[PDB]
Design a protein around this motif. Structure first.
Motif, PDB file in Angstrom:
ATOM      1  N   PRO A 126      54.940   5.093  41.224  1.00 27.44           N
ATOM      2  CA  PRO A 126      54.106   4.623  42.528  1.00 27.44           C
ATOM      3  C   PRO A 126      53.287   5.634  43.223  1.00 27.44           C
ATOM      4  CG  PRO A 126      56.335   3.558  42.392  1.00 27.44           C
ATOM      5  CD  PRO A 126      56.400   4.503  41.231  1.00 27.44           C
TER       6      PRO A 126
ATOM      7  N   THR B 160      59.488   2.936  29.742  1.00 30.41           N
ATOM      8  CA  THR B 160      58.223   3.628  29.784  1.00 30.41           C
ATOM      9  C   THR B 160      58.480   4.688  30.820  1.00 30.41           C
ATOM     10  OG1 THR B 160      57.225   2.133  31.475  1.00 30.41           O
ATOM     11  CG2 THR B 160      56.940   1.524  29.147  1.00 30.41           C
ATOM     12  N   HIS B 161      59.401   4.677  31.498  1.00 34.05           N
ATOM     13  CA  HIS B 161      59.728   5.584  32.610  1.00 34.05           C
ATOM     14  C   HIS B 161      60.623   6.734  32.181  1.00 34.05           C
ATOM     15  CE1 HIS B 161      57.154   3.396  35.917  1.00 34.05           C
ATOM     16  NE2 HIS B 161      57.778   2.488  35.157  1.00 34.05           N
TER      17      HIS B 161
ATOM     18  N   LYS C 273      56.669  17.092  42.922  1.00 37.43           N
ATOM     19  CA  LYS C 273      57.822  16.368  42.485  1.00 37.43           C
ATOM     20  C   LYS C 273      57.941  16.549  40.900  1.00 37.43           C
ATOM     21  CE  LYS C 273      59.576  14.530  45.971  1.00 37.43           C
ATOM     22  NZ  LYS C 273      61.159  14.576  46.475  1.00 37.43           N
TER      23      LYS C 273
ATOM     24  N   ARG D  38      54.996  10.066  30.452  1.00 41.58           N
ATOM     25  CA  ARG D  38      55.844   9.030  31.090  1.00 41.58           C
ATOM     26  C   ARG D  38      54.909   7.953  31.744  1.00 41.58           C
ATOM     27  NH1 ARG D  38      60.031  12.484  33.083  1.00 41.58           N
ATOM     28  NH2 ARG D  38      61.047  13.567  31.251  1.00 41.58           N
TER      29      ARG D  38
ATOM     30  N   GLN E 142      80.403   6.232  15.520  1.00 41.50           N
ATOM     31  CA  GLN E 142      79.497   6.871  14.898  1.00 41.50           C
ATOM     32  C   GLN E 142      78.215   6.215  14.743  1.00 41.50           C
ATOM     33  OE1 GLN E 142      82.520   6.942  13.690  1.00 41.50           O
ATOM     34  NE2 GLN E 142      82.964   9.139  14.880  1.00 41.50           N
TER      35      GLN E 142
ATOM     36  N   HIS F  18      61.043   0.381  41.611  1.00 41.51           N
ATOM     37  CA  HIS F  18      59.775   0.940  42.106  1.00 41.51           C
ATOM     38  C   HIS F  18      60.128   1.591  43.331  1.00 41.51           C
ATOM     39  CE1 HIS F  18      58.240  -1.262  38.655  1.00 41.51           C
ATOM     40  NE2 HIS F  18      57.519  -0.345  38.333  1.00 41.51           N
TER      41      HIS F  18
ATOM     42  N   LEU G  49      61.368   4.989  43.066  1.00 42.20           N
ATOM     43  CA  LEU G  49      60.418   5.971  42.582  1.00 42.20           C
ATOM     44  C   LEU G  49      59.314   6.726  43.566  1.00 42.20           C
ATOM     45  CD1 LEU G  49      59.480   4.188  38.871  1.00 42.20           C
ATOM     46  CD2 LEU G  49      61.276   6.246  39.665  1.00 42.20           C
ATOM     47  N   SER G  50      58.999   5.664  44.297  1.00 45.41           N
ATOM     48  CA  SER G  50      57.932   5.877  45.225  1.00 45.41           C
ATOM     49  C   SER G  50      58.604   6.989  46.361  1.00 45.41           C
ATOM     50  CB  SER G  50      57.492   4.915  46.112  1.00 45.41           C
ATOM     51  OG  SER G  50      58.471   4.330  46.761  1.00 45.41           O
ATOM     52  N   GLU G  51      59.875   6.952  46.374  1.00 44.12           N
ATOM     53  CA  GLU G  51      60.618   7.922  47.360  1.00 44.12           C
ATOM     54  C   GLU G  51      60.607   9.453  46.828  1.00 44.12           C
ATOM     55  OE1 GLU G  51      64.481   6.343  47.980  1.00 44.12           O
ATOM     56  OE2 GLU G  51      64.163   4.582  48.728  1.00 44.12           O
ATOM     57  N   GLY G  52      60.362   9.466  45.570  1.00 44.48           N
ATOM     58  CA  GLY G  52      60.273  10.848  44.832  1.00 44.48           C
ATOM     59  C   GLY G  52      61.314  10.923  43.944  1.00 44.48           C
TER      60      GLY G  52
ATOM     61  N   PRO H  72      62.421   9.529  29.676  1.00 41.36           N
ATOM     62  CA  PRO H  72      62.031  10.465  28.434  1.00 41.36           C
ATOM     63  C   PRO H  72      63.447  10.292  27.345  1.00 41.36           C
ATOM     64  CG  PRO H  72      63.492  11.446  30.422  1.00 41.36           C
ATOM     65  CD  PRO H  72      63.305  10.053  30.634  1.00 41.36           C
TER      66      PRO H  72
ATOM     67  N   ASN I 176      81.626   1.525  13.799  1.00 45.52           N
ATOM     68  CA  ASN I 176      82.432   2.459  14.209  1.00 45.52           C
ATOM     69  C   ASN I 176      81.789   3.272  15.322  1.00 45.52           C
ATOM     70  OD1 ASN I 176      80.598   4.259  13.075  1.00 45.52           O
ATOM     71  ND2 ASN I 176      81.550   4.340  11.164  1.00 45.52           N
TER      72      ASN I 176
END
Lengths: 122, 122, 122, 122
Positions: B98, A12-13, B104, B94, A83, A46, A49-52, A15, A81
């Motif tokens: 947090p 979910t996080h 960002k 997305r 592919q 997480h 993520l909070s760090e940016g 793309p 294979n």
RNA sequence: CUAGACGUCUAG
RNA sequence: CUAGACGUCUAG
């Protein structure tokens, strides 16, 4: 939290679909679960993520710093294979180096019916 | 210069309709206005354009450097569902991280009728 | 070779009619002729085609690298209204930036009877 | 498997009649057969289809990656005039570039009774 | 220099 | 569906 539910949550996080990072989410999720570090792994993710940082930067960082992944050799995945490998991952396939490990950016090792091998590299 | 007029002006510099950048234009304008930086913002926007940057690169740059946007959490927008969100933006949705901040790349947070949330990322 | 004949020749290399690239062919041909670089311009254009690039890729490339176009401000074209601009170009119209130049992708500036201005952007 | 049979087989995978892709099927087949790669070509074509690609995407891809087509100049086809060229192809005609090659999307070169030439581009 | 994810337009 | 041009974000 199971490896499946864990991987889905990381999805979910991220793309797009079936990207190298998606494969990395599955791999790191399973290794974490079997290590009993499911909760700690999620927390660290997480925290980053909070760090940016974004999901992608978080996964690559965790793969390099999370002790549970250190020295761990990428899992071997069987496929008809090369592919058969998800399209968004195909161009990231390399010949397997002597000592592949996750902390070195190697997500997994694909094995073809013909015995050939390719490593997914991030 | 009101937020609406400011946004409408930025729109004239943007290709297509209802793109992530269109949403960013509205968010940035609204925030700039109530900050009393409506004028400074527009000037900075024109300055960047004169440097050779296009409208899109100018908005993203401002969102990262314009002090009035630093540390500011993206606004929450109610929608029936995530299919209600403008077409051009849907694939840029997305899971909300947090600590989402505009500097960002996080434009806004969409909330559905069943309490679900998605963040618009550029 | 006259600007007209020059533009017509380029037209044979372009798909469709009255596209942004058609307008660019006219603008570049006009500027090239006036500079006495008609021959050189045509040579460079074909040199690029031989490289494997198509007409469209050649025109945008020349507009960025051909010295005769560097720093040159797009020509102002008068029109009743912006709906008078060729259909295929209408959706490529933007507000005019502070310092429009051809080497930046700005083909021409349309001026309506109402004094409004729009720039054709590739 | 002759060039004719090979082309007829590719036709069964293509929508409509006498489209640019139909002409490509003929050209690619003719070239493949004369190279002794008739079999390899067909296998590669089927391989691509199994990957989820449609016939059209498969042909264009092969024309870009199949070694037997790399650097090969499009064949010259005589026609009364450019209105004699299959209708579905007419709007894809352009001036022949300096060094046309199949791996660059150039299917064939049509020459009229007046010594004029047009290239079929996909 | 790789690769991934988007957006806008054009031509068939 | 195919081909092309322009641009934005990101990872190694």
């Amino acid at each position: 939290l199971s490896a499946k539910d864990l991987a889905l949550l990381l999805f979910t996080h991220l793309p797009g679909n079936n990207t190298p990072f998606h494969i990395l989410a599955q791999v790191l999720s399973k290794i974490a679960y079997k290590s009993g570090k499911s909760g700690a792994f999620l927390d660290a993710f997480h925290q980053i993520l909070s760090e940016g940082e974004n999901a992608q930067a978080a996964l690559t960082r965790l793969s390099r710093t999370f002790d549970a992944f250190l020295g761990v050799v990428p899992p071997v995945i069987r496929v008809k294979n090369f592919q058969t490998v998800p399209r968004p991952c195909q161009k990231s396939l390399r010949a397997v180096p002597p000592n592949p490990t996750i902390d070195k950016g190697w997500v997994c090792v694909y094995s073809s019916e013909q015995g050939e091998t390719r490593a997914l590299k991030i």
